[PDB]
Amino acid sequence: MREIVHIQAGQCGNQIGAKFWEVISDEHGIDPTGSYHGDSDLQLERINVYYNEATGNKYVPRAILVDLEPGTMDSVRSGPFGQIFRPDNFVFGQSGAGNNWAKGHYTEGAELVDSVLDVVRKESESCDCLQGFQLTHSLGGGTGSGMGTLLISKIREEYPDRIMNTFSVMPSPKVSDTVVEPYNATLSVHQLVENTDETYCIDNEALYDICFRTLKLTTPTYGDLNHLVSATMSGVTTCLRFPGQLNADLRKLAVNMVPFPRLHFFMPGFAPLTSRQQYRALTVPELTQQMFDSKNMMAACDPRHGRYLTVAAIFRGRMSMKEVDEQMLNVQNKNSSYFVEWIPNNVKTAVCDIPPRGLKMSATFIGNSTAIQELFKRISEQFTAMFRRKAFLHWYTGEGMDEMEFTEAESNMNDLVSEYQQYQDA
Amino acid sequence: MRECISIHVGQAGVQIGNACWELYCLEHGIQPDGQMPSDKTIGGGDDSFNTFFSETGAGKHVPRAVFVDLEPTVIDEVRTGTYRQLFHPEQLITGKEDAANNYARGHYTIGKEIIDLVLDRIRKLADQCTGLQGFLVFHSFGGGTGSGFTSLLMERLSVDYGKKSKLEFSIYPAPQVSTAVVEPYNSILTTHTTLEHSDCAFMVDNEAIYDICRRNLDIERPTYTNLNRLISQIVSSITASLRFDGALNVDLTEFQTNLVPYPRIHFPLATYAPVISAEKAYHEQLSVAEITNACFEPANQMVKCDPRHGKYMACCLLYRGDVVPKDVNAAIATIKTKRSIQFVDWCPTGFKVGINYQPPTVVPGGDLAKVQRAVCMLSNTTAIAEAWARLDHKFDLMYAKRAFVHWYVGEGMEEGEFSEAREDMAALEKDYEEVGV
Amino acid sequence: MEVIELNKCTSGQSFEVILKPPSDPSLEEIQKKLEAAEERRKYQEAELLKHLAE
Amino acid sequence: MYTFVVRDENSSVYAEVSRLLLATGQWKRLRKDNPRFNLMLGERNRLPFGRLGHEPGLVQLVNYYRGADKLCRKASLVKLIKTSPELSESCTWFPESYVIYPDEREVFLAAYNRRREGREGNVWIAKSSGILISSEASELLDFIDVHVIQKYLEKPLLLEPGHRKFDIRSWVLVDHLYNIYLYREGVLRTSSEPYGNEMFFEEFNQYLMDALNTTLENSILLQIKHIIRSCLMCIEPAISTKHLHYQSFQLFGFDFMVDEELKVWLIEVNGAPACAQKLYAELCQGIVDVAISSVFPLAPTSIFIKLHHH
Numbered sequence A: 001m002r003e004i005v006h007i008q009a010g011q012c013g014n015q016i017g018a019k020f021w022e023v024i025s026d027e028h029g030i031d032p033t034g035s036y037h038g039d040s041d042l043q044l045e046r047i048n049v050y051y052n053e054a055t056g057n058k059y060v061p062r063a064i065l066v067d068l069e070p071g072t073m074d075s076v077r078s079g080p081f082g083q084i085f086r087p088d089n090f091v092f093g094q095s096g097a098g099n100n101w102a103k104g105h106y107t108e109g110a111e112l113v114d115s116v117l118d119v120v121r122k123e124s125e126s127c128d129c130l131q132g133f134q135l136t137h138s139l140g141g142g143t144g145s146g147m148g149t150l151l152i153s154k155i156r157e158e159y160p161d162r163i164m165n166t167f168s169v170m171p172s173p174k175v176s177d178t179v180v181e182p183y184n185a186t187l188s189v190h191q192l193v194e195n196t197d198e199t200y201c202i203d204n205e206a207l208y209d210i211c212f213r214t215l216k217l218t219t220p221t222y223g224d225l226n227h228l229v230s231a232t233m234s235g236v237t238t239c240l241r242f243p244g245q246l247n248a249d250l251r252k253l254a255v256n257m258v259p260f261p262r263l264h265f266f267m268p269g270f271a272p273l274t275s276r277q278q279y280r281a282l283t284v285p286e287l288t289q290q291m292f293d294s295k296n297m298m299a300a301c302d303p304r305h306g307r308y309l310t311v312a313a314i315f316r317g318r319m320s321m322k323e324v325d326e327q328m329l330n331v332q333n334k335n336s337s338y339f340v341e342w343i344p345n346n347v348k349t350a351v352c353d354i355p356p357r358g359l360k361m362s363a364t365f366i367g368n369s370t371a372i373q374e375l376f377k378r379i380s381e382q383f384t385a386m387f388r389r390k391a392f393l394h395w396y397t398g399e400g401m402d403e404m405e406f407t408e409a410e411s412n413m414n415d416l417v418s419e420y421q422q423y424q425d426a
Numbered sequence B: 001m002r003e004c005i006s007i008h009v010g011q012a013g014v015q016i017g018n019a020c021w022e023l024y025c026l027e028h029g030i031q032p033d034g035q036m037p038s039d040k041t042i043g044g045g046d047d048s049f050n051t052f053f054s055e056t057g058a059g060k061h062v063p064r065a066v067f068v069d070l071e072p073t074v075i076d077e078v079r080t081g082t083y084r085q086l087f088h089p090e091q092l093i094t095g096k097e098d099a100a101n102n103y104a105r106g107h108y109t110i111g112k113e114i115i116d117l118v119l120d121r122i123r124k125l126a127d128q129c130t131g132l133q134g135f136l137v138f139h140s141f142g143g144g145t146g147s148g149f150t151s152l153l154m155e156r157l158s159v160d161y162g163k164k165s166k167l168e169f170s171i172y173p174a175p176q177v178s179t180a181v182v183e184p185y186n187s188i189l190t191t192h193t194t195l196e197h198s199d200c201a202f203m204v205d206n207e208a209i210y211d212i213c214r215r216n217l218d219i220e221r222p223t224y225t226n227l228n229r230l231i232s233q234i235v236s237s238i239t240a241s242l243r244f245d246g247a248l249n250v251d252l253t254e255f256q257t258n259l260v261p262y263p264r265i266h267f268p269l270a271t272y273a274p275v276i277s278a279e280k281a282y283h284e285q286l287s288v289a290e291i292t293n294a295c296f297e298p299a300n301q302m303v304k305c306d307p308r309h310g311k312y313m314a315c316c317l318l319y320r321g322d323v324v325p326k327d328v329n330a331a332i333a334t335i336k337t338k339r340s341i342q343f344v345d346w347c348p349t350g351f352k353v354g355i356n357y358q359p360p361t362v363v364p365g366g367d368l369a370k371v372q373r374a375v376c377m378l379s380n381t382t383a384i385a386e387a388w389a390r391l392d393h394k395f396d397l398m399y400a401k402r403a404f405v406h407w408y409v410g411e412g413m414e415e416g417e418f419s420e421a422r423e424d425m426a427a428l429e430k431d432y433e434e435v436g437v
Numbered sequence C: 001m002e003v004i005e006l007n008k009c010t011s012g013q014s015f016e017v018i019l020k021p022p023s024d025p026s027l028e029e030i031q032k033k034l035e036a037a038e039e040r041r042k043y044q045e046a047e048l049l050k051h052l053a054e
Numbered sequence D: 001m002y003t004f005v006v007r008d009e010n011s012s013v014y015a016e017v018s019r020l021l022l023a024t025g026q027w028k029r030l031r032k033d034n035p036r037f038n039l040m041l042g043e044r045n046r047l048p049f050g051r052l053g054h055e056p057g058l059v060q061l062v063n064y065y066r067g068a069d070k071l072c073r074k075a076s077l078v079k080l081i082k083t084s085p086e087l088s089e090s091c092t093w094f095p096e097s098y099v100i101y102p103d104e105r106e107v108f109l110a111a112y113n114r115r116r117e118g119r120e121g122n123v124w125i126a127k128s129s130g131i132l133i134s135s136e137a138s139e140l141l142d143f144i145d146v147h148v149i150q151k152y153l154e155k156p157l158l159l160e161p162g163h164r165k166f167d168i169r170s171w172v173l174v175d176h177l178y179n180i181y182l183y184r185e186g187v188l189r190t191s192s193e194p195y196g197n198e199m200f201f202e203e204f205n206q207y208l209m210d211a212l213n214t215t216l217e218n219s220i221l222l223q224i225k226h227i228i229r230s231c232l233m234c235i236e237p238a239i240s241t242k243h244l245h246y247q248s249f250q251l252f253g254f255d256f257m258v259d260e261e262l263k264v265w266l267i268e269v270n271g272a273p274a275c276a277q278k279l280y281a282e283l284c285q286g287i288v289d290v291a292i293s294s295v296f297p298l299a300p301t302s303i304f305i306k307l308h309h310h
């Protein structure tokens, strides 16, 4: 009875978090009213990992919705599955964070963090055995970025022996709201390197490139971007939600994916990515090849420019597990130079019989690759371009921060890049 | 009659134990409700099957077993399975947080919280014993609980039951059905701590079981149930001498006497034959000579290695079914003229043979075909050191970069315990080389 | 080729065939090492909470 | 696309095999410690046979037979030839040897004293696996202070004109199926002195026809194929990889002497032989054909003579 407490913070965190709950509720047979109407035993066997059970055979997501402004959370409450959330678990302010990390982390967000920890405490106190937390947020804004990392630090203080997992959306000039996004992301990465066990790096650059180049969407919207995030988040949590030969939890994922404490930033990948051919049947070799293809990576990093430390693959749908193991071993034997030799058998594959909605079969890729340094190099370059002239810093010094905190954040992220490059050449 | 207590630790130990106790009930005619119509001594008796089963006043035959796991989902299947009525809740011990594939967590952090509860439940089984021989411990090498809590338990069993014997059934890690990258770490850590507490350990490599299931049972992708059905047959033919009338390996002490001349070299190689597919309707029954010769084909061993490039210290042939002594000696006389069987100079070139006329029982509807005669060969050959060499090499690759070490130190382990454990394994590899080279 | 120790019964038969003749830590020590690892766990957690308090 | 690793840079034979494998476009050389390989061109010493055949989804082949050193070590060959029921019965083609540890000291002197008593040829050569040849047993035992004392062929076949001594080197390939292939080309290494120094079979055959009115096949090669077959079939139950988790092939170098009565004697077996310069291309291609491509096929006479056995 290992429960996961889910937390979504900010506009992006609440939008990808709400889509996550719509998607997995459908897979587990939970209607918007919280009543189960599925037809499989596998749907409910591990339902307690993400859902509480209220009276009347209702299932309530163990989710906490946080934002410094009520706008995005009103959209959730009016959204499709908005009535499935516990009403007490809506914790919101009124001022907003103004796309400012300092407001989220220091001034506006400190004012609201205590009532969020109160809701976290009530959910944790009714857990038979808490695994830890998964957080959805962006790094380019203010609430998810600044207040989200403040939550992570305070949650660790009260729950130092629980796993902290984040779905962190990286900013990109291709999909940009404000120019201060490299500042907010660099400050957040500093916090993530220290206080999370597992971060799924969801780069908006990759999501945009996939929509534009692969899915042939000339003008991608956030809904299009979040369609990929929903699909990826469903796949990476499959082995936490469904019974199988390999049952995972948040700690087993961290132990096996993270050889060194700071290198816990993962490249997600998904196949198929089909443009609306949605009826055409994909073979197991095709899923395996696309799953490792860089055009299916959600972190805008070319894996062939680095080496894989660890890889977790999950195949969903009814297929030959014999053929799945064949194709996965074939990819390793064909491209053996891209897997580090000092971690033997660093690829593990799992199979779930239940495919996601609208797919006869799929494949999700969780890789800890050294190529992820490309993502942090990109942010570090965008950061340095402005910081060398102290551009836009007054928004942050006006909230009490000083420049030294920026210098330390950039230094820590450069170290992270160097640490990934170190084991790429080990 | 002297009792044997079985202890199943972790997912691999529990799921294998469930398969073994199902097979035991089929072999002894014990129904899932615990009743045994052939047993005429109601609520007692000192028969051979009473080594593994006690009896209540109602006639229920209860296994002398205890299942322990640091999480409840695997043992819950025992509470729900066909043989749920066999056990009482005190025998099924579960925790909250499992070891998360981390030896340090199973041994230090979480095992320390539950070690007293397990010992108290084992004491309750030991008090019902008029003369306990010792314990049979089933566990994986790679699991956090199977490695971590087992080595803690084996330490405490040597304290509380110093004069008792402890035999091991260990699942050597294979990547094809593994669950963690750190199984080499956990395997070496638990071997170093358990080495001086186990009197005899039977290693089963999942790689060998997997490939035997593929090539002899025509199973495309063997699952745990496939592997455990085959493992349960091998465990049964090993423990049969404790559960039936016989004269070979009748108590746990004889396992060490007949197979372990040197205490550290206590890992006999198991070879089993024949493995016939049940889907194969037309089956030609193999002879005594054919199944005995199959005991020397590396493709039939529970650990893949080459006994030709090693030395035998001890060999035991365990026949079940229609086998007569004369047929064994004619098979051995033929095999010695053809096979490469090199014994150490300080041991006699010979075989201790045990025959039980009852043929192997197969689970109804299973993958294994019923045969007229089968054999399990237990041979302490230095060739099994190959498995240690492979495992130590995988350990050396990760440890050279200290990869994943922080998860162990983060639970209170010291980095020095790794090198201390590795040096012991280096000494063990040297002990095998000094014996057979 | 010599067959010795032939013991027979209703359940089966056993014997030996020869071909060629030849030519613990106390509970106190365990408890100290387990508590030592718990101390190192508590120390590392205390340093963490101290860092977080800063 | 198959993968292979090179773990013996000093091997001139398999440096050429590696060159040919890459020249096919369907083989890829990995780092020497990459375990995800199909073929291992391994090292001569301490080859990790225990780690072969354990990588999932890979058929692994090595260029050495585990246990073949019993044939390629001089002391081991003498003990094998003396104790094996399949060889010790005959051994009319192997010179009288004795393994002397620095033991058959008494048995050597027993046959030695008989030769001096009968005034027979009593010259013995001592060697290891530094050589001394002497007619006094005292000088032999003192020279070795493990060695073997072998009878030195006092009446060798001498090529003319030149009165020169020679040996014959034959290359034998044993594949994963334990087929025994004898390379059609051997070499004769001439001593160049009265009792580049390389004579090949075509000339040697012509000499035997001109000088002795016989053929290489009839006078020498039948005994060669008999000795090669006897040595390799003897150890087949000990080294075969038929039902093993990995497969083995190996190239051997057999060394023969011919006495003046056209009788062939075995001298040594080489587990890591080099080839003749002229024959490197042909033999290495045959190694790829019958030993490597047989297991890993790619997308016509034979340079080998298949020694038939049951």
Ligand SMILES: Nc1nc2c(ncn2[C@@H]2O[C@H](COP(=O)(O)OP(=O)(O)OP(=O)(O)O)[C@@H](O)[C@H]2O)c(=O)[nH]1
Binding pocket: B009, B010, B011, B012, B013, B015, B016, B069, B098, B099, B100, B101, B102, B106, B140, B141, B142, B143, B144, B145, B146, B147, B171, B172, B173, B174, B177, B178, B179, B183, B206, B224, B225, B227, B228, B231
């Ligand atoms: N043959 C066989 N092997 C198993 C079985 N279950 C697990 N294993 C092996 O055990 C190893 C993993 O150890 P587990 O027993 O699953 O882990 P654990 O003992 O429960 O401890 P944790 O890691 O904390 O969960 C893998 O190498 C598996 O191949 C089983 O039912 N049969």
Ligand SMILES: Nc1ncnc2c1ncn2[C@@H]1O[C@H](COP(=O)(O)OP(=O)(O)CP(=O)(O)O)[C@@H](O)[C@H]1O
Binding pocket: D095, D125, D127, D131, D150, D151, D152, D153, D154, D166, D167, D255, D257, D267, D268, D270
């Ligand atoms: N019994 C014997 N009678 C005559 N000559 C002998 C002999 N034993 C060895 N020789 C001589 O020594 C040669 C082979 O000896 P040896 O086994 O030492 O070769 P070697 O190992 O030193 C180098 P290679 O392996 O290339 O032959 C023969 O070709 C011959 O000239």
Ligand SMILES: Nc1nc2c(ncn2[C@@H]2O[C@H](COP(=O)(O)OP(=O)(O)O)[C@@H](O)[C@H]2O)c(=O)[nH]1
Binding pocket: A009, A010, A011, A012, A013, A015, A016, A097, A098, A099, A100, A138, A139, A140, A141, A142, A143, A144, A145, A169, A170, A171, A172, A175, A176, A177, A181, A204, A207, A222, A223, A225, A226, A229
């Ligand atoms: N993929 C995705 N990215 C988003 C979404 N909403 C905002 N973002 C990104 O998040 C950053 C803006 O942060 P935001 O969440 O709006 O700020 P916050 O509400 O203060 O936490 C920018 O990089 C946006 O591109 C969304 O729905 N999906």
Ligand SMILES: COc1cc(Cn2cc3ccc4cnoc4c3c2)cc(OC)c1
Binding pocket: A236, A237, A239, A240, A246, A248, A249, A252, A253, A256, A257, A310, A311, A312, A313, A314, A345, A346, A347, A348, A349, A350, B178, B179, B180, B181
């Ligand atoms: C396979 O899918 C998974 C796996 C897991 C656990 N893990 C990751 C691994 C990476 C490499 C190797 C080598 N042998 O084992 C493993 C691994 C086991 C957690 C999970 O939770 C999200 C989903």
Ligand SMILES: [Ca+2]
Binding pocket: A095, A108, A111
């Ligand atoms: Ca305010």
Ligand SMILES: [Ca+2]
Binding pocket: B039, B040, B041, B042, B043, B044, B045, B046, B055
């Ligand atoms: Ca009774």
Ligand SMILES: [Ca+2]
Binding pocket: B158, B162, B196, B197, C024
């Ligand atoms: Ca003891």
Ligand SMILES: [Mg+2]
Binding pocket: A011, A012, A141, A177
């Ligand atoms: Mg916004």
Ligand SMILES: [Mg+2]
Binding pocket: B010, B011, B071, B098, B099, B143, B145
């Ligand atoms: Mg477990």
